[PDB]
């Protein structure tokens, strides 16, 4: 009975749901040549979180726990804690801790630590290799490559803050990260579990509409494109509103609030993704004050006006 809606926020006022950075732009392109199955930024229109999705954008791609030095290296194993420092529970029916990275790549940031007895602190450059055989956040373990073999203490609270991505070469620039390749959450040769499903346009002439950011790059020639299916603020809003879906497809209009002019229309599917009627790769040109407006629940045969 509660009416459905989407927030009155512009694209630039919103946040990527797959990495803690603002949205920049809207992009559409074909996606039949890869699997689109991100686990962050997944939520139904009536407020059910999916995959590894949680509510605040600052927790995405962060890790916390205690660390142990890996002998012969400058690397450390982190034994993951919950976000609130309670024990991690590996038995919950999720793919990995909520907010775990959902792509294969090298995420560079800073590993910080506080010694509880005197409040002394330290911080070091650190990279997590989410395509590594030993990356196993579902089992409670990840490793960080750092610039020290001696400075981090055992049994002291340690945090990783993500900054950006790196690339170390290949046959071409921009060969990594691979934003549509899921990690193996329990390490090499394991089954991922409890995934949010892959998404694809089912209606002829339609493509996914992506909410796009550019991840900072920290070294090399990385592919910094990062597309999410829902802004983080839409996840937060649907969770809060929990308005029942009256059909499987919500018709949205993208509107200029100064003129009331509709720039394009699109479909917001109840399971939490957007499609437009377009063929090809296209960067949308929008007024910066434009926003999305829910206009009607529609049936399964609605043809959108060309984007």
């Amino acid at each position: 009975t509660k009416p459905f809606s989407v927030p009155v926020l512009t694209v630039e006022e919103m946040t990527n749901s797959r990495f803690p950075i603002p949205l920049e732009k809207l992009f559409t392109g074909p996606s039949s040549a890869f699997v689109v199955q991100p686990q962050n930024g997944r939520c139904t229109t009536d407020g059910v979180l999916l995959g590894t999705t949680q509510l605040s954008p600052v927790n995405i791609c962060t890790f916390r726990g205690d660390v142990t030095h890996i002998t012969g290296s400058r690397n450390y194993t982190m034994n993951l804690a919950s976000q609130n420092w309670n024990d991690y529970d590996p038995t919950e029916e999720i793919p990995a801790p909520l907010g775990t990275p959902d792509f294969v790549g090298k995420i560079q940031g800073v590993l910080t630590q506080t010694t509880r007895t005197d409040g002394s602190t330290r911080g070091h450059k650190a990279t997590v290799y989410t395509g590594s055989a030993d990356f196993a956040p579902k089992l409670g373990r990840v490793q960080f490559e750092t610039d020290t073999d001696r400075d981090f203490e055992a049994n002291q609270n340690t945090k990783f803050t993500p900054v950006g991505v790196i690339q170390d070469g290949g046959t071409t620039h921009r060969n990594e990260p691979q934003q549509w390749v899921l990690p193996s959450y329990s390490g090499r040769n394991t089954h991922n579990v409890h995934l949010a499903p892959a998404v694809a346009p089912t209606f002829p002439g339609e493509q996914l509409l992506f909410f796009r950011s550019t991840m900072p790059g920290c070294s090399g020639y990385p592919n910094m494109d990062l597309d999410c299916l829902l802004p983080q603020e839409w996840v937060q809003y649907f969770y809060q509103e929990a308005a029942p879906a009256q059909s499987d497809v919500a018709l949205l209009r993208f509107v200029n609030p100064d003129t009331g002019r509709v720039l394009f229309e699109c479909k917001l599917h109840k399971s939490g993704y957007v499609t437009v009627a377009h063929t090809g790769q296209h960067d949308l040109v929008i007024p910066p004050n434009g926003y999305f407006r829910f206009d009607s629940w529609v049936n399964q045969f609605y043809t959108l006006a060309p984007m």
Partner: nanobody
Amino acid sequence: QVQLQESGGGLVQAGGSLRLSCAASGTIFSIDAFGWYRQAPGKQREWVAGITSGSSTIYADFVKGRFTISRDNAKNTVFLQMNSLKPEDTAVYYCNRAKPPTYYSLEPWGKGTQVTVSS
């Protein structure tokens, strides 16, 4: 768990040869693809050569037939035979698990091995 250990670097004169070795453990060596990479001070790290589990090879544009990557599954070792060396090849060289077809690396790095080519 994964370990990568390079050896065989050294100082050589322009036009000389080196043979690099890389000992890899912690994986199923025979099903992995491997790559060689290099980085000089103040420059970006770059890929040099790759080899599939089938022992097919592929090289960066600057190799120009002078280097040969190979593998010995029996010994869990990858090799880079380096001929006709030039000063532009000076760098720390590293081996890693790699993902074909573009050969991005997968693991934290080993210590690498220094190659220095005098003019």
